[PDB]
Design an enzyme around this catalytic site. Sequence first.
Site, PDB file in Angstrom:
ATOM      1  CG  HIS A  83       5.187  16.462  53.502  1.00  0.00           C
ATOM      2  ND1 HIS A  83       5.007  15.363  54.303  1.00  0.00           N
ATOM      3  CD2 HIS A  83       4.020  16.641  52.832  1.00  0.00           C
ATOM      4  CE1 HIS A  83       3.762  14.922  54.167  1.00  0.00           C
ATOM      5  NE2 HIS A  83       3.136  15.678  53.277  1.00  0.00           N
ATOM      6  CG  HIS A  85       1.102  18.178  51.808  1.00  0.00           C
ATOM      7  ND1 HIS A  85       1.104  16.923  51.220  1.00  0.00           N
ATOM      8  CD2 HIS A  85       1.218  19.067  50.785  1.00  0.00           C
ATOM      9  CE1 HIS A  85       1.285  17.052  49.912  1.00  0.00           C
ATOM     10  NE2 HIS A  85       1.353  18.338  49.627  1.00  0.00           N
ATOM     11  CG  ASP A  87      -0.479  15.536  56.606  1.00  0.00           C
ATOM     12  OD1 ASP A  87       0.167  16.338  55.893  1.00  0.00           O
ATOM     13  OD2 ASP A  87      -0.455  14.277  56.421  1.00  0.00           O
ATOM     14  CG  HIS A 148       3.515  12.373  49.929  1.00  0.00           C
ATOM     15  ND1 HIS A 148       2.209  11.972  49.736  1.00  0.00           N
ATOM     16  CD2 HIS A 148       3.451  13.500  50.667  1.00  0.00           C
ATOM     17  CE1 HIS A 148       1.394  12.873  50.268  1.00  0.00           C
ATOM     18  NE2 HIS A 148       2.124  13.808  50.840  1.00  0.00           N
ATOM     19  CG  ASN A 179      -2.361  14.740  47.904  1.00  0.00           C
ATOM     20  OD1 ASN A 179      -2.212  15.042  46.725  1.00  0.00           O
ATOM     21  ND2 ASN A 179      -2.090  15.577  48.904  1.00  0.00           N
TER      22      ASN A 179
HETATM   23  C1  LIG Z   1      -3.746  16.499  53.860  1.00  0.00           C
HETATM   24  C2  LIG Z   1      -2.965  15.226  53.583  1.00  0.00           C
HETATM   25  C3  LIG Z   1      -1.566  15.598  53.164  1.00  0.00           C
HETATM   26  S1  LIG Z   1      -0.418  14.189  52.891  1.00  0.00           S
HETATM   27  C4  LIG Z   1      -3.596  14.453  52.479  1.00  0.00           C
HETATM   28  O1  LIG Z   1      -3.577  14.783  51.365  1.00  0.00           O
HETATM   29  N1  LIG Z   1      -4.219  13.224  52.824  1.00  0.00           N
HETATM   30  C5  LIG Z   1      -4.302  12.720  54.162  1.00  0.00           C
HETATM   31  C6  LIG Z   1      -5.062  11.432  54.071  1.00  0.00           C
HETATM   32  C7  LIG Z   1      -5.695  11.440  52.747  1.00  0.00           C
HETATM   33  C8  LIG Z   1      -4.834  12.330  51.895  1.00  0.00           C
HETATM   34  C9  LIG Z   1      -3.810  11.551  51.222  1.00  0.00           C
HETATM   35  O2  LIG Z   1      -2.613  11.765  51.483  1.00  0.00           O
HETATM   36  O3  LIG Z   1      -4.106  10.754  50.372  1.00  0.00           O
HETATM   37 ZN   LIG Z   2       1.441  15.204  52.225  1.00  0.00          ZN
HETATM   38 ZN   LIG Z   3      -0.025  13.104  54.908  1.00  0.00          ZN
END
Ligand SMILES: C[C@H](CS)C(=O)N1CCC[C@@H]1C(=O)O
Ligand SMILES: [Zn+2]
Ligand SMILES: [Zn+2]
Length: 231
Positions: A83, A85, A87, A148, A179
């Site tokens: 996706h 984001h 990460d 998500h 998130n």
């Molecule tokens: C940057 C990522 C994208 S899924 C993010 O929002 N995170 C990673 C761990 C915490 C938070 C989440 O998804 O709740």
């Molecule tokens: Zn994400």
């Molecule tokens: Zn993530």
Amino acid sequence: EYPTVSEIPVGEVRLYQIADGVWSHIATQSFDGAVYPSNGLIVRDGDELLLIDTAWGAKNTAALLAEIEKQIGLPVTRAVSTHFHDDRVGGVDVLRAAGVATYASPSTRRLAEVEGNEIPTHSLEGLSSSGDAVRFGPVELFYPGAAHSTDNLVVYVPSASVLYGGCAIYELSRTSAGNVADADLAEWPTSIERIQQHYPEAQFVIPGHGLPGGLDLLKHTTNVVKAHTNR
Ligand SMILES: C[C@H](CS)C(=O)N1CCC[C@@H]1C(=O)O
Ligand SMILES: [Zn+2]
Ligand SMILES: [Zn+2]
Ligand code: NA
Ligand SMILES: [Zn+2]
């Protein structure tokens, strides 16, 4: 045995071998004043490697390539981001400079551009409608519908019965939604059910963040998402 957030300094990457020629990669990052872990996948394809997702940023993704060279020693020739984001695509430029052909759906590429995140070069066609699957070398890519995020993909490795659910799937330790800024809460459980119906043979299920499990992670995620929906 599975590397945990407590064990990995930000900047370092661990690999965890799931089966012959299948590994997850695990990295960590500062987020909300905490440290969170994040998973990707590596799948051997002949004498080359397919990478699923970056290691959540450029520094970590450089570390990822170095750890792959150290522990496996075969070239990463392609990568798929599941996706838009950071990460998943943060580190794409590192991969590209290293000669990796980076891929994502047009949905992901469009959203990454809007968001100001890195944009994988190649486009994965055939994944824009819920329930769509395409083969990509040693994996199958599946678009379960919005969850998500609008663009979230899952990845199945048929040789190993490994289902990489990415951030559409939560680990058991997460009991409250994270998130959801880009989520479709209304569709998320339906999308999960499509994953269950398409991959009911899956044995090893990997969440975007945290410890792997089995197909019970699907129900678990539905439980948490429905609780948030009813907040
Ligand atoms: C940057 C990522 C994208 S899924 C993010 O929002 N995170 C990673 C761990 C915490 C938070 C989440 O998804 O709740
Ligand atoms: Zn994400
Ligand atoms: Zn993530
Ligand atoms: Na399939
Ligand atoms: Zn290319």
